[PDB]
Amino acid sequence: DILGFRAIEHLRRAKEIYDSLNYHLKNATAIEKLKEAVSMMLSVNYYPKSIEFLLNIANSMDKGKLACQYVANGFLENDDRKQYYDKRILVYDLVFDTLIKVDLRQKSYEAALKYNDRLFHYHMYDWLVSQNREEKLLDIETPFILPYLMEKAGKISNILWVYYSRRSKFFESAEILYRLATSNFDITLFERIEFLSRANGFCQLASRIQDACEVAGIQGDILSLVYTDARIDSAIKDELIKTLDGKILSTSELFNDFAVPLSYHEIALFIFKIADFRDHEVIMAKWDELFQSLRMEFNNTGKKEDSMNFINLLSNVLIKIGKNVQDSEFIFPIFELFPIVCNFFYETLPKEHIVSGSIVSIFITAGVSFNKMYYILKELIETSDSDNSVFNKEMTWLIHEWYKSDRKFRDIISYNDIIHLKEYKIDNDPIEKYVKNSGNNLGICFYKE
C-alpha cells in the first residue's frame, strides 16, 4: 500500500530529473498501479530496462513455471491455477503495449528476444502474427522460435510459408511443403504443385514427393479437360473443380469417378502407367476406346482436307499421351500398337490420303528412337505371312528419315546405297547389309530432335 506510494514517489522524483531508475527496479522486486509506474519510466526514454523490469516482475510472481502447466492442460478449471496465466498476460500485454510505443529502437527489441521466457516469446510471436509482422519471425534467432513455429504448424499457411522458408536446410524445408501440399485446408493445386515444384527442388521422401507431383499433374489434366468438355454444366464442373484443385485423390477414384464417366481415355491410360498396371487385355481395351471415340468426331467427306486435319489431330493426341507413356512397355506396346494404328488409319481414310510415314512418324515424334522402332518393324514384317505392303512403305519412309537426320548413319551407308530403297525388303535392307560386314553396333539410340 504505502510502499507503493513511495515507489511511485521514487519515480516521481526521477521524472522531475540513473539512481532513481534503480530505486524503481528495486521498488518492483518488493496492476493499473503497475502500468502508471512504467508510463513515467518511459518519459526519460527508459524502454529497454523497462522491459526487463516488466519481465522480471512477470517471473517474480509466478516463481515459477506454474502458468506453463496451466497451458499444458489449457483448461478452464483451476488446472495449474489459471490466475498466474491471466496475470502474466496483462504484464506481457504491457510489454507489447510498450514495445509498440517504440515506433536506438532496436536495443529495446533485442532485450525481449535476448531474454529467457518461453511463454513470453510464444506470446510475443502470437502478438507479431496479429499485426502481421509475420515476416519478422523469419528474422528471429531465439531458442524458442523453432518450437513455436513447429507447434503452431497446423492462415497457418503463413506459419508454414514461414517455416519451409525459415529452414535454410533443405530436407526439413521440403518435408514441410510436402505436408503443405498433402494437407487439409483449401489450397489450390497450382500452389499445391508449386509447393512440390519447390519441395522437389530442395531434394523415401523423394519417392512420396514425385508420386505426388505425378498424381497432381493428372488432376491438372482432367481439370483442363473439364473446361473444354461440353458435356458439363458449369456448376457440375465447379463442384468437380472444387474436388480437383482441393487435393490428391485415390487413383481408382480418379479413374472410376472421372476418366471413365467422362471417357477421358488418355487420362485413364496415363493413370495406368503411374499405377504401374500391366493387364494387356484391359490396357488394349482402353486403347480401343481411344481410337473408337476419335473416329466418332471425324467427318469423312473424301476431301483431302478433313483427311489431313484428322490425320493431324489424331497424330497429335497420340504423340501427347505417347510422350507420357512411351517409356512403359506395357502401357505402350509398340508391337501391338503400331499395327492397330495403321489399321485405324486405312479403316477410316481414303487410301490416297494416307502418305508413307504418317503412322510411324507419330511414334518417332512420341519419343521412340529410330533404333527401337526399326527392329520392331522389321520383326513385324518378317513375322507376318501377309502382304506387308503398308509396313514396307513406312519402313521405307523411316530409313530415309533416319539417314537425313543422323550423320552417324550416313557414315555407314552411302547416299547411293540409300536412293535405291524405294520400298523396303529384308534383302534390300541397307542396315542388314552393313551388319553382315561390320557388326550389329549401330551406336547409341538416335532420337528425333
From Swiss-Prot:
Note, other: Present with 1560 molecules/cell in log phase SD medium.
Full-sequence range covered: 1000 to 1502 of 1502
Family (UniProt): Belongs to the non-repetitive/WGA-negative nucleoporin family.
Assembly with partners or alone: Component of the nuclear pore complex (NPC). NPC constitutes the exclusive means of nucleocytoplasmic transport. NPCs allow the passive diffusion of ions and small molecules and the active, nuclear transport receptor-mediated bidirectional transport of macromolecules such as proteins, RNAs, ribonucleoparticles (RNPs), and ribosomal subunits across the nuclear envelope. Due to its 8-fold rotational symmetry, all subunits are present with 8 copies or multiples thereof.
Protein role: Functions as a component of the nuclear pore complex (NPC). NPC components, collectively referred to as nucleoporins (NUPs), can play the role of both NPC structural components and of docking or interaction partners for transiently associated nuclear transport factors. NUP170 probably plays an important role in NPC assembly and organization. In addition it is required for chromosome transmission fidelity.
Official protein name in the record: Nucleoporin NUP170
Compartment annotation: Nucleus, Nuclear pore complex; Nucleus membrane
Organism of derivation: Saccharomyces cerevisiae (strain ATCC 204508 / S288c)
Chain ranges passing through the membrane: none
